[PDB]
């Protein structure tokens, strides 16, 4: 077959990390409009059939721990896994309220060899965050 | 055996090295577009068809506006990274 098998008890877990407020020392401002994103994402992924959980203003440690524990749960009866990150960011990293953490390390928890119940299952990550300071002026 | 890095999909709001835009009143461009496409096709299109449509919507429907001429009329294009080994549909 050419499609992922979706015949499971449930579609899966959808974790939303909504970081709006950051510590002064990071130099990052409040992300006004992010609550609206989180609300819309939550309603939207719930409609799709995901069991969504929304976390707010997470520290780097909380983000890491939260995703590590999710990867250690039993996904045997789920078709897939989704994670949505809303925060500031720079190339290859995303901001916690107290700093920056590698996106690679956050997603590594779900690798085939570290989360066997998701093996051969799609692991989706949606990321709203900057990845540098370049601007696209556009053309046409 | 299956590669450990297999079956991941990263849907980034923007491309490497660039900023990503957000409207304090409506939310980030990427999220607006994604929810909009998902609400209308989340259950009948393949994940890549959905994200490609999100790419187009973000690229054509949005343009930044700032009192600062430096950050005025700027554009954005999302970035989809796929290591999926099958097509993904959210229904059935």
């Amino acid at each position: 077959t050419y499609q992922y098998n979706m015949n499971f008890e449930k579609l899966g877990k959808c974790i939303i990390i909504n970081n709006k407020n950051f510590d002064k020392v990071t130099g990052m401002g409040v992300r006004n409009g992010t609550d609206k994103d989180a609300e819309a994402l939550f309603k939207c992924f719930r409609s799709l059939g995901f069991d969504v959980i929304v976390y707010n203003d997470c520290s780097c440690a909380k983000m890491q721990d939260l995703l590590k524990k999710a990867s250690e749960e039993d996904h045997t009866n789920a078709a897939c896994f989704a994670c949505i990150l809303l925060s500031h960011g720079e190339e290859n990293v995303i901001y916690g309220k107290d700093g920056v953490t590698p996106i690679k390390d956050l997603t590594a928890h779900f690798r085939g060899d570290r989360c066997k119940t998701l093996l051969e299952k799609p692991k989706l990550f949606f990321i709203q965050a900057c990845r540098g300071t370049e601007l696209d002026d556009g053309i046409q | 055996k299956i590669p450990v890095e297999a079956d991941f999909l990263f849907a980034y709001s923007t491309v490497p090295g660039y900023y990503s835009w957000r409207s304090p009143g409506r939310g980030s461009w990427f999220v607006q577009a994604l929810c909009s496409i998902l609400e209308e096709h989340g259950k009948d299109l393949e994940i890549m068809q959905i994200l490609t449509r999100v790419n187009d919507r973000v690229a054509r429907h949005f343009e930044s506006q700032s009192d600062d001429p430096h950050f005025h009329e700027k554009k954005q294009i999302p970035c989809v990274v796929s290591m999926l080994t099958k097509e993904l549909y959210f229904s059935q």
Partner: peptide, 4 residues
């Protein structure tokens, strides 16, 4: 608009 703002940048993220």
């Amino acid at each position: 608009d703002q940048m993220x």
